[PDB]
Design a protein around this ligand. Structure first.
Ligand code: MG
Ligand code: MG
Ligand code: MG
Ligand code: MG
Ligand code: MG
Ligand code: MG
Ligand code: MG
Ligand code: MG
Ligand code: MG
Ligand code: MG
Ligand code: MG
Ligand code: MG
Ligand code: MG
Ligand code: MG
Ligand code: MG
Ligand code: MG
Ligand code: MG
Ligand code: MG
Ligand code: MG
Ligand code: MG
Ligand code: MG
Ligand code: MG
Ligand code: MG
Ligand code: MG
Ligand code: MG
Ligand code: MG
Ligand code: MG
Ligand code: MG
Ligand code: MG
Ligand code: MG
Ligand code: MG
Ligand code: MG
Ligand code: MG
Ligand code: MG
Ligand code: MG
Ligand code: MG
Ligand code: MG
Ligand code: MG
Ligand code: MG
Ligand code: MG
Ligand code: MG
Ligand code: MG
Ligand code: MG
Ligand code: MG
Ligand code: MG
Ligand code: MG
Ligand code: MG
Ligand code: MG
Ligand code: MG
Ligand code: MG
Ligand code: MG
Ligand code: MG
Ligand code: MG
Ligand code: MG
Ligand code: MG
Lengths: 214, 118, 122, 54, 113
RNA sequence: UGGUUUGGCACCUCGAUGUCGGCUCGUCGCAUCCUGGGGCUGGAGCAGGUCCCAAGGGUUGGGCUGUUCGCCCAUUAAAGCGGCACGCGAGCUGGGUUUAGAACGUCGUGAGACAGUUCGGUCUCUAUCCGCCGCGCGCGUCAGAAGCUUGAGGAAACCUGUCCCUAGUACGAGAGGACCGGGACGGACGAACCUCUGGUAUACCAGUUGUCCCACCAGGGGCACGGCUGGAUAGCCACGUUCGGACAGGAUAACCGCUGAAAGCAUCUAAGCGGGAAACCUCUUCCAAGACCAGGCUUCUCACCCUCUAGGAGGGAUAAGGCCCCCCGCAGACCACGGGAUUGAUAGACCAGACCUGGAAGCCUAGUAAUAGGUGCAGGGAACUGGCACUAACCGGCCGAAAACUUAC
């Protein structure tokens, strides 16, 4: 129904289309993964499949997680996530212990990307929210970049909870939809995605089959 | 080397360079020096780079070290004794030891020394 | 890369020398002009004996820009002085001779007479 | 600006309480035949005798 | 090492002649015209070059009817057919930005012999 | 009906309620500008006139007067009407109005005045509370920990234009010129990103003026906005690169209906059954079990004492785990967050590469000279990538676990 696969962001690079075009792409290493658990309606109340990724030494992991993985019947891994399906026929396809690779996708099929944004740190209003400052000369009094008026006078007499103003930004989940896929390399198990995707070098990223149009 | 991520130490790049050179020459002359921790942290790579330049003795290296530290006696003693003594060692030319805090300003110190085990 | 209240050099034989940008067409609050865009402007200085005297209002099209412009292939273009061409309603030139080279985008912008009359194209 | 009213005693004490200091940890080190306590941040200094102890 | 090297190598283009900034060069560029292609020749001088491995780029300049023109090409662009170096130059700096304020005879560059 | 202009009453505030526009920033109503759906026409069609429903989004840039108001210049769909102490000076601007000069004109013989005119004229305050934007410590979820998730419940966004087909067809004397449905290309706004273009680069490179210094030549350094000039690796950004504006379903307002007596007929209705929109509910993204009904699926340990007086409680010693200190980051106000601790590539150095810069010193040669050529893709170098335990993470300290019971099985 809706296929999915984990991976990691690597960097940027160019590729030239057969029609002699130019299109920047991103390199994503969708490494092999394993299935550790399956969620069924009568057991949990929904349908989804659990995945795992990453190579870690056995002594790193903690004992409860090690025991869970041993009961599942696979070696330890670093990260774990799940894909939420919509029916029972689809989940019937997946079984515990199965191995998935990047081949599952085909070129020309639009997908979605999920990840975390950058860390920008505390920032001013004009930068975080794109306010417009005021005159930098002709009689300023050190109000070059501060917003200014904030609300009414005695009616109602508050700040109208939800007003847009200064505060920290970034470091949150962000997703983009219907991104074109250019080429797939089997031996290297890497993806070439047109455009730019969120995240940082050596970060975590999960890609899913397109919903809007796919 | 990596430039200081935050604001400079003394209040100017010129002061940074001058203080760093003074600390380097004092270290070379004495061998053991104790001062504030951040100063030693900043100094360590500079001393390592200077000893690297010293290791492969030659006229060009002589000119460079002179240009940097500006003291004939210190350069002479350096290339007379230190250079050969570090012939067989690759990297790791200095060590920093944390020491007790100050009383006037409550700012930590640290002592740095030249490796002498071998 | 032209905005309001700009000075552009005319590369035509109609008699105009410099025209004063008024604003650019193509949509409400259209801000930036690019190669192959219809613009309305007024002439400031012109040859005394020219067909059109100073102070009239006319329409023109940008043909040369000084700001690097991305080409779909990857090549780039910039010129040493902005140039525009006097045009009328029928999307044809008012003059008869074009001076200096002209860009390539006019071909896919459908201005055929200008490209045909141009001495060189790029 | 300026404050309008004198706050309550309970409010004052409650806000004041949080303002305090925290003690550091200690480690046992043996030098010259007797054991004395020093912070772990000074272990090497104590071992090499570069820190004076009263 | 440019960890992307194992992906860049596949698209890397060989058979590109060596050259240096400040040299007279002419380039053959492919073009599409109403579904029919032709070969267009552009003769000029190079003034800058950014090292970019797969993304390395260079520029060419020519004077035409009293108004200068320049172009930028990706070094590995398939639209490029032949690079034909003509002469060898000699300038102290690797960038020739200062030419933009010179006209006529002043734009001439010494020939390397 | 509205209390929004000009008005009438003096009831709260002269041991103070600081004032018109403009800048920035909202929020609300519909008496609707477009965007949407209908109907009646003195509706051929395009295009017009009028009425009904509908508040999700948008509503430009300039010239003139301080101006409000108002006139004008060029496009788009439009350049909507109003309230919130004629929104907002403990956010800002002082152009006139309302201080002290002087002048013009008038009135007054005079000291002066004249909602008549012209010129310049000090805008104070270190955040106690409410509120708001973010982040922490503590505490319960009924043995104590750890991984993964359901979603009650909330927030974010909701914009359009041009062109080509259908077809010069329907229509119309001609001129002129369609509904509906497809296809291609654009404006604004927002989010992400640094691979191409651009901005930045206080320990990079080269040249160069003056001066002082290292015995002197050579070669170097300090200072003079980095002394001034020509260049940029990384990171952060836009003028740069991608992508977003739904489709579909459910129930509705305006309207159009099918079957039908009261009331032998008729009627969309009083019983019933149907169609019908950027309006409402799911459907898109994000937050979310402090939701006290304190959720769900799993794994780990489920055991050693002492005391008061045996009713429970307190104290000490432990397992699972956690914390402190240490090296770090693109995580960062501090905290927290993420990785690492010799069973090791976390940082530093070394080597190597990419990259930047542009041809080192010494020697030799030619030239009296100032200079050029060979040794030579030369010399120097931070941010990107790989190997190497050479240096630094250590003979280490602190917290941390079932009063129980009742009912059917
Ligand atoms: Mg933004
Ligand atoms: Mg501004
Ligand atoms: Mg001030
Ligand atoms: Mg200021
Ligand atoms: Mg009264
Ligand atoms: Mg009263
Ligand atoms: Mg009163
Ligand atoms: Mg007062
Ligand atoms: Mg007020
Ligand atoms: Mg006021
Ligand atoms: Mg109404
Ligand atoms: Mg209508
Ligand atoms: Mg009507
Ligand atoms: Mg409305
Ligand atoms: Mg809306
Ligand atoms: Mg005026
Ligand atoms: Mg209001
Ligand atoms: Mg007011
Ligand atoms: Mg008002
Ligand atoms: Mg308001
Ligand atoms: Mg204030
Ligand atoms: Mg206040
Ligand atoms: Mg006055
Ligand atoms: Mg006044
Ligand atoms: Mg007076
Ligand atoms: Mg007076
Ligand atoms: Mg008189
Ligand atoms: Mg009188
Ligand atoms: Mg008198
Ligand atoms: Mg007058
Ligand atoms: Mg005055
Ligand atoms: Mg005042
Ligand atoms: Mg004040
Ligand atoms: Mg206060
Ligand atoms: Mg506060
Ligand atoms: Mg919900
Ligand atoms: Mg720049
Ligand atoms: Mg920049
Ligand atoms: Mg000297
Ligand atoms: Mg000498
Ligand atoms: Mg100096
Ligand atoms: Mg200065
Ligand atoms: Mg400096
Ligand atoms: Mg400079
Ligand atoms: Mg360069
Ligand atoms: Mg930037
Ligand atoms: Mg009836
Ligand atoms: Mg009926
Ligand atoms: Mg609970
Ligand atoms: Mg523990
Ligand atoms: Mg931490
Ligand atoms: Mg030299
Ligand atoms: Mg470096
Ligand atoms: Mg790095
Ligand atoms: Mg304890």
């Amino acid at each position: 129904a809706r296929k999915g696969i984990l991976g990691t962001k690597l960097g940027m690079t160019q590729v030239f289309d057969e029609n002699n075009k130019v299109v920047p792409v991103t390199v994503v290493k969708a490494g092999p993964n394993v299935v550790t658990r399956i969620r069924t309606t009568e057991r949990d109340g929904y349908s989804a499949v659990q995945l795992a990724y990453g190579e870690i030494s056995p002594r790193k992991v903690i004992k409860p997680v090690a025991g869970q993985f041993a009961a599942a019947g696979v070696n330890p891994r670093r990260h774990v996530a799940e894909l939420r399906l919509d029916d029972e026929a689809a989940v019937a396809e997946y079984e515990v212990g199965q191995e998935l690779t990047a081949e599952i996708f085909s070129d020309g099929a639009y997908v979605d990307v999920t990840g975390t944004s950058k860390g920008k740190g505390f920032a001013g209003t004009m930068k975080r929210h794109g306010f417009r400052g005021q005159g930098a000369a002709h009689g300023a009094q050190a109000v070059h970049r501060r917003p200014g008026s904030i609300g009414g006078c005695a009616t109602p007499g508050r700040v109208f909870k939800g007003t847009r103003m200064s505060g920290r930004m970034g470091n949150d989940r962000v997703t983009t939809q219907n991104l074109k896929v250019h080429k797939v390399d089997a031996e290297n198990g890497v993806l070439l995605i047109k455009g730019a995707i969120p995240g940082r070098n050596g970060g975590l990223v999960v890609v899913r089959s397109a919903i809007k149009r796919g | 080397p990596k430039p200081t991520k935050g604001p400079r130490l003394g209040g100017s790049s010129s002061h940074q360079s001058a203080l760093l050179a003074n600390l380097a020459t004092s270290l070379f002359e004495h061998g053991r020096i104790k001062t504030t921790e951040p100063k030693a942290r900043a100094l360590r790579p500079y001393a390592e780079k200077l000893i690297t330049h010293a290791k492969k003795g030659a006229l060009h290296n002589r000119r460079e070290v002179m240009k940097k530290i500006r003291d004939k006696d210190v350069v002479h003693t350096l290339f007379a004794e230190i250079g050969p003594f570090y012939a067989d060692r690759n990297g790791g030319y200095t060590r920093i030891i944390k020491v007790e805090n100050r009383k006037g300003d409550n700012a930590p110190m640290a002592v740095i020394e030249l490796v002498r085990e071998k | 890369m032209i905005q309001q209240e700009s000075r552009l050099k005319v590369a035509d034989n109609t008699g105009a020398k410099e025209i004063l940008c008024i604003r650019v067409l193509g949509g409400s609050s259209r801000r930036y002009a690019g190669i192959g865009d219809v613009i309305v402007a007024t002439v400031k200085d012109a040859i005394p004996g020219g067909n059109v005297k100073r102070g009239d209002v006319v329409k023109a099209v940008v043909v040369r820009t000084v700001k690097e412009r991305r080409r779909a292939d990857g090549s780039y273009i910039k010129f040493d002085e902005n140039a525009a061409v006097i045009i009328k309603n029928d999307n044809d030139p008012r003059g008869t001779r074009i001076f200096g080279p002209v860009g390539r985008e006019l071909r896919e912008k459908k201005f055929m007479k200008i490209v045909s009359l141009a001495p060189e194209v790029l | 600006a300026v404050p309008k009213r004198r706050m309550s005693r309970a409010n004052t004490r409650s806000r004041r309480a949080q303002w305090k200091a925290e003690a550091p940890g200690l480690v046992t080190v043996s030098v010259a035949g007797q054991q004395r306590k020093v912070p772990r941040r000074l272990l090497k200094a104590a071992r090499l005798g570069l820190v004076d102890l009263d | 090492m440019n960890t992307l090297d194992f992906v860049d190598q596949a698209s890397l283009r060989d058979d590109i002649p060596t050259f240096s900034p400040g040299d007279t060069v002419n380039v053959h560029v492919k073009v599409i015209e109403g579904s029919k292609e032709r070969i267009q020749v552009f003769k000029g001088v190079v003034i800058r070059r950014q090292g970019g491995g797969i993304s390395e780029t260079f520029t060419v300049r020519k004077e035409s009817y009293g108004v200068g023109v320049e172009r930028t090409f990706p070094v590995h662009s398939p639209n490029i057919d032949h690079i034909d170096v003509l002469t060898r130059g000699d300038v102290r700096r690797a960038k020739l930005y200062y030419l933009r304020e010179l006209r006529g005879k002043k734009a001439k560059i010494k020939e390397k012999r």
